[PDB]
């Protein structure tokens, strides 16, 4: 009995396009929160994110929409975000926005820099369906994320 995770949120991604949660239609998404000035571990979930990508685009032909939400909204500023996700994984796009968008976001996906443990999977209806954490390696990771992709349904069964 997956927790009622997600829902509406209005943030900017680090470009100053606006980026709702309509936008999580149509695609498998894989969301993270943190934010630059976090120390040692957000960086290794971003590398882990981007093994976790690569593999899954040249083994297993899937496309994720990779999205990097900020918490510290007063000093992430979309110039910010671009410059430190340039070490990372070039498909992941930082999001962010005042302190009452942002804080929306963190709440709806009861987030309240150790709380970044998790990486949030949404299809393509834009509801949760698995949060990864910590015990998943480069490997069980991918394992996970490719039968869910695999067994999604439109819901609709038609
Ligand atoms: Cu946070
Ligand atoms: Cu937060
Ligand atoms: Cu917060």
Redesign the pocket.
Known sequence: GKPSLGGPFHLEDMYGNEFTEKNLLGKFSIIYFGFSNCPDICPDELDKLGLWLNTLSSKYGITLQPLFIT?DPARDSPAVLKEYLSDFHPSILGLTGTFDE??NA?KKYR??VDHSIFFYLMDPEGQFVDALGRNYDEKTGVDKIVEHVKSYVPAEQR
Do not use: D, F, L, N
């Open positions: 918490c942002v804080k963190c987030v309240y």
